[PDB]
Structure 1
């Protein structure tokens, strides 16, 4: 289990998950709020 936790704290997987999180954030943003131009 601890081995698993360490494997998840490895670098590229963390980069992965953070990017996935951010991207899903912004995609949902555009979904619910389409066509942003100003403000």
Structure 2
């Protein structure tokens, strides 16, 4: 974890973990709030 977490903090893994979370969030926004063309707020 002095070097395992260093590998986990690298540029491709952190891009995979962020965009996995980012596309995971935007899909789950698009399930409970789908077809969103106009922001009502």
Which range, TM-score by smaller chain?
A: 0.7 to 0.9
Q: How many residues align?
A: 39
**Aligned equivalents of 2:27 and 2:16: distance in 1?**
16
The RMSD of aligned alpha carbons is: 1.0
TM-score by length of 2: 0.79
Q: What corresponds to 1:27 in structure 2?
A: 27
Q: Which runs of 4+ in 1 moved over 2 A?
A: none
Q: Give ranges in structure 1 of 5+ residues lacking alignment.
A: none
Q: Give ranges in structure 2 of 5+ residues lacking alignment.
A: none
